[PDB]
Amino acid sequence: SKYGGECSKEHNTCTYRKDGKDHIVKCPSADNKKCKTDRHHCEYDSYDRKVDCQTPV
Ligand SMILES: [Cl-]
Ligand SMILES: [Cl-]
Ligand SMILES: [Cl-]
Numbered sequence: 275s276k277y278g279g280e281c282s283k284e285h286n287t288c289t290y291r292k293d294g295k296d297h298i299v300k301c302p303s304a305d306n307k308k309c310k311t312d313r314h315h316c317e318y319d320s321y322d323r324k325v326d327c328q329t330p331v
Contacts, residue, residue, distance in 0.1 A: 275319065277297075282309060288300075307325070
């Protein structure tokens with residue numbers, strides 16, 4: 275369902291692993307989902323069709 279990776283603060287992207295490959299998707303521009311901290315964990319949720327670059331911990 276959920277595919278994990280790390281985000282780029284400079285580019286506001288999430289690079290996630292799926293099917294043995296890395297995929298780079300823009301993070302949201304929303305304040306509490308964008309990449310605020312370089313290399314923060316991020317997730318692509320394939321069920322909900324959404325990205326978050328401020329995943330909880
Ligand atoms: Cl790859
Ligand atoms: Cl915007
Ligand atoms: Cl806020």
